[PDB]
Design a protein around this ligand. Structure first.
Ligand SMILES: [Ca+2]
Ligand SMILES: [Ca+2]
Lengths: 479, 479
């Protein structure tokens, strides 16, 4: 098997239709959207909102909590006094209604997708490599549970961005540990204190050495062919005037995400390891933007038997919304579209747990991590060529600035930013300082919060390095 | 949509570079040629033949059979004992070598293009309307397969000018039938017994009424604004001293083709239907003249699953050579250059099948004819204006006649002329007559053969008229 290096990049809050649905103009096999027979949702006197291609580079932030996504997929709001966790008929009819409930007029942005030319990096990559148009988010919930699934095939009961749980760190076994036990290498290249540190086990001294600053190490390791077997690229989630976020989370400029993907792809393409690389791009969840494919509700297993917190008490028996997923490798036929899986079970689906599962399949790891990656589809069959393609694009099209626009910066911390701030302050003991934590979470600007997070993270790394130099046990966490 | 009338003219045997490559002087956006960084081919001690701009109005006849074009595109001769049908990436390095193989010294004419001033009509048109510099002939083969593709999106396995197959008529469904089934009108205006009667279905009594003599009917229907929805103009392929061929087929005077295009354009421009007209000019294939753009060999589908005849057993998995293609309409911006398509598939290309595919797209016909037009790019997006131009040229530059030159006329029948003679003789039963068909094909002058063809075709039309007057069924063919 030719794949010895697997790269993973997880962007933020975009549905498959919203991002790639108008790419059906460029490949009829893509389960996207059309203008002649368009998709639509109804807002309730009653209005029909048709799915169009007028998405802008800066968008409002639709609802993407478990309750919002419940309304989006089932077409009726959640009612904690009349809890209906398994209504049965996911018709994807509530996106516009939930959008209007969250913010008047937002159903326009929720029911819009991008023109392919507005995402030229994605245009070239889709036309030259592979995508999956049946890849669902692991959880019909927010950011962090899905991100936990990406590298652990579970969220350990989490259905929200509970900052206390993330500060404590999630204790489940990760794919990094499976790889390390099987004798394989891994590395996390971060542009900012990364979300993978929400895994408790990655905070051990033996695994902190696998973290490397992006910019110092990434392009270097690409150039000299020293990339590990499993490389994770983590980006910037704080949106500052001095440094824009590049994670595609709404209100952030998606052109910055295009630039990030361009840079990563071009670094991997010129690497001596290009002929042994499989590069996977996905989105943690759909961000509340519309998609027409009903979320699977049948035969979806709970990964570990842990239920979600009240009032929802989520059983993890239904998947999230379709997200854009890209497979990039010289061993892939250009223009390939992967649909649903063939096994390992009749109700198997492609989802975030497909990444550990497939990793387990490619490196012949002993065990699955949970019931989810044991049940999820594996996409190793996307590697079909007898020899690697030699005329893959070396440089991708440049994202171009719009004329006469103005840069943006959020006033209040987003949930991701607040999660990182609360983790930083729990490491520093400022969390037990009640008024300091309230000031940090509610009364500091985003630039100050980013500085606080970077300072706390650098301090934690300093302490871990000193502990490792003292001869402390490999397996200990510094705090 | 403003286009209600589509007019089509197909000239003979010119490559894009040979005809319009020096037009890059007039529009830098054209993927043509230059003198500072010129194209070249090698002839084997080795010689370098540089592409120049010294084409004359009368040229030798380069090789344009499937084997000749194989050598031209792949840079090595075909070998029926060592058949290598898919050798890989075409480098377009064999034009001069194949030219010298066919006739000593012919690489000069093959490696030459026209000065723009030598084609004034085209010049004006190119600067006042649109061209496509990524429009490939449907087949890397001779005349008739490509012409079959023009109006049917397939050649039904044909890769040669097999006169028996053309006499029998090709039975595939045509764009004419698609239009007639949807209630749309069509008309074929012929200056000579036309090549569209190589389609068997057009020989039915119900469709023979759609054929009109050009001199009688074309300018009349243009003036009275009674042009049907789909208009095909067919010209003269016999080159007589008393009546020159105007199809631009080599050894014929290209100035006559310029005159023909001028006449057709002026008849359409002064028509009341000018504001609803889209006029397409193309060439059936490249004639063996040089071009630098590699022929697409990836993702090209066989239209109907039929293989070419031995020894080549062509799979129809690679396209022919770039040809000049003009889009003319008051709704088109002047000086426009169309490149490759955007869909419907990642490896889609512009080719002759783009004409039916676009027709189906403009008139909203139910079905494509084959996999080719289902896959070919469509160019309805060339119609961009909000209102039709009013200052389009009313008359085009006159083509000048060089002083001191003499007229030309071939001795032996060309393959096109022999095809028409054999069709005429098969209709009359003269093909049964061995000695008489040998006499007609090898022993009669071109004027006598032209008269024979016209007589046979007029008597065929006479018998069809008599049959229709008997009350014969609409769908029958007279023989
Ligand atoms: Ca998210
Ligand atoms: Ca020809």
């Amino acid at each position: 098997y030719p794949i010895k290096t697997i790269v993973v990049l997880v962007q933020e809050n975009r549905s498959f239709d919203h991002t790639l649905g108008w790419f059906k103009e460029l490949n009829r096999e893509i389960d996207g959207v059309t203008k002649s027979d368009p998709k639509s949702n109804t807002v309730s006197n009653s209005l029909r909102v048709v799915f169009g291609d007028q998405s802008q580079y800066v968008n409002p932030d639709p609802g993407h909590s478990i309750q919002d996504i419940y309304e989006q997929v089932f077409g009726k709001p959640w009612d904690s006094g009349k809890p209906d966790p398994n209504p049965g008929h996911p018709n994807m009819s509530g996106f516009a209604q939930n959008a209007e409930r969250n913010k008047k007029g937002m159903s326009s942005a929720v029911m819009n997708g991008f023109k392919p030319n507005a995402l030229p990096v994605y245009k070239e990559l889709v036309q030259n490599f592979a995508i999956c148009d049946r890849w669902f988010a692991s959880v019909p919930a927010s950011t962090q549970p899905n991100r936990l699934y990406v590298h652990s095939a579970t969220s350990h009961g989490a259905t929200s961005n509970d900052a206390a749980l993330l500060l404590e760190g999630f204790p489940q076994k990760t794919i990094f540990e499976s790889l390390d036990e099987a004798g394989f290498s891994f590395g996390i290249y971060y542009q900012f204190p990364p979300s993978t540190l929400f895994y408790r086990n990655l905070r051990k001294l033996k695994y902190l050495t696998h973290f490397h600053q992006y910019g110092i190490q990434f392009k270097k390791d690409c150039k000299e062919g020293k990339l590990p077997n499993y490389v994770v690229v983590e980006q910037r989630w704080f949106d500052l005037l001095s440094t824009p976020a590049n994670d595609d989370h709404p209100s952030h400029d998606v052109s910055e995400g295009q630039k990030l993907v361009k840079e990563v792809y071009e670094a991997l393409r010129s690497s001596p390891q290009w002929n042994e690389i499989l590069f996977i791009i996905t989105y943690d969840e759909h961000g509340g933007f519309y998609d027409h494919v009903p979320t699977p509700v049948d035969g979806v297993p709970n990964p570990d038997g842990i239920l979600g917190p009240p009032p929802y008490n989520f059983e993890f028996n239904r998947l999230g919304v379709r997200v854009p997923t890209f497979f990039i490798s010289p061993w892939i036929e250009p223009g390939t579209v992967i649909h649903g899986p063939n096994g390992p079970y009749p109700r198997s689906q492609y989802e975030h747990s497909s990444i550990p599962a497939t990793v387990k399949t490619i490196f012949k790891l002993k065990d699955f991590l949970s019931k989810r990656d044991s049940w999820a589809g594996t996409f190793e069959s996307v590697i079909t060529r007898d020899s690697p393609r030699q005329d893959c694009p070396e440089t991708l099209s440049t994202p171009i600035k719009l004329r006469g626009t103005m840069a943006k910066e959020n006033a209040q911390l987003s949930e991701f930013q607040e999660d990182l701030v609360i983790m930083a302050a729990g490491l520093k003991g400022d969390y037990k300082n009640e008024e300091l934590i309230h000031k940090l979470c509610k009364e500091t600007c985003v630039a100050d919060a980013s500085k606080y997070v970077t300072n706390a993270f650098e301090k934690f790394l300093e302490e871990s390095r000193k502990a490792r130099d003292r001869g402390c046990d490999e397996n200990d966490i510094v705090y």
